[PDB]
Design a protein around this ligand. Structure first.
Ligand SMILES: *Cc1cccc(C*)c1
Ligand code: NI
Lengths: 19, 287
């Protein structure tokens, strides 16, 4: 899959840790 | 003949005493720090209290000052691991070099800014503070640091617009004093500065911060992260995007101390932790 979808999921997981 | 040997004995008792004071200062606390606006290379003619023990520096170096030897010389160290204490030329000493040169020739930037003893960490990016993407990504980093550096760290929220530190002016000046105070014990200081979204906003202050750029490389990624937070947050997509673009246009080596462009939190956290552990060693010699 693309580099962009990968980055996105990285940062979505990053954000969930702050929840 | 035997009075030339009296002159030498005078010089070296003076050197022995300065040396003794230098040995004692090794375990004294740090009184304050300076950021250098000029360079200095020690030279025989400067008359160092202990020859061989002057501290040379470039512009924008940091010095920890322990105490005063006399009006020409302080005692302290360059903030760099391996660097132990020596003699730092006072602002009087450096100005008198110029002045001496000028008074003989006829026959305004201070050399130092006083700065927090530990440079405070300010996070900027990926976009605007006060919206969820930026607030949550930074919060995750603050949470990491509070755990990794337990015992060695102060984290504090600064709500005052300290960019106005080049009613409010009272609150701002108070927050600057409090930051200096937190740093005096040589713990890592980390600011959650609500108003600071760009490195230029702290340029004229004397906080001399470690600026950390939390960078999302791709604007399309940020666009999708913002939308992932829903309509309320997606409503303000535009302000968030330009705020992000402005950071990306900053010249990096001039604007930032650390750039975290890793898309995984653990990697960003460990990059930052490496930097701060190196800063800890620089600010905490085994001497
Ligand atoms: C789909 C995918 C493959 C490898 C790495 C990532 C982040 C994503
Ligand atoms: Ni633990």
């Amino acid at each position: 899959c693309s580099p962009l979808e990968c980055d996105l999921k990285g940062y979505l997981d990053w954000i969930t840790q702050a929840e | 003949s035997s009075l030339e040997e009296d002159r030498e004995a005078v010089r070296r008792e003076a050197e022995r005493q300065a040396q003794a004071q230098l040995e004692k200062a090794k375990t004294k606390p740090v009184a304050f720090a300076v950021r250098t606006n000029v360079r200095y290379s020690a030279a025989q003619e400067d008359d160092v209290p202990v020859p061989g023990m002057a501290i040379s520096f470039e512009a924008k170096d940091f010095l920890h000052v322990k105490e005063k030897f006399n009006n020409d010389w302080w005692i302290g160290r360059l903030v760099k691991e391996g660097c132990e204490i020596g003699f730092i030329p006072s602002p009087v000493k450096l100005e008198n070099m110029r002045l001496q040169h000028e008074q003989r020739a006829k026959q305004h930037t201070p050399p130092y800014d006083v700065v927090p003893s530990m440079r405070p960490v300010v996070l900027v990016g990926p976009s605007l503070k006060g919206y969820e993407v930026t607030d949550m990504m930074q919060k995750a980093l603050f949470d990491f640091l509070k755990h990794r550096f337990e015992g060695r760290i102060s984290i504090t929220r600064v709500t005052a617009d300290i960019s106005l530190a080049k009613s409010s002016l009272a609150e701002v000046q108070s927050e600057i004093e409090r930051i200096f105070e937190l740093a005096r014990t040589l713990q890592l200081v980390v600011l959650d500065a609500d108003t600071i979204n760009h490195p230029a906003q702290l340029s004229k202050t004397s906080l001399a911060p470690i600026i950390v750029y939390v960078k999302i490389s791709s604007p399309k990624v940020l666009q999708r992260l913002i939308k992932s937070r829903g309509k309320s947050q997606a409503k303000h997509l535009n302000v968030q995007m330009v705020a992000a673009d402005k950071l990306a246009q900053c010249p990096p080596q001039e604007s930032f101390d650390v750039i975290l462009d890793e898309n995984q939190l653990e990697d960003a956290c460990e990059h930052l932790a490496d930097y701060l552990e190196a800063y800890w060693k620089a600010t905490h010699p085994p001497s």
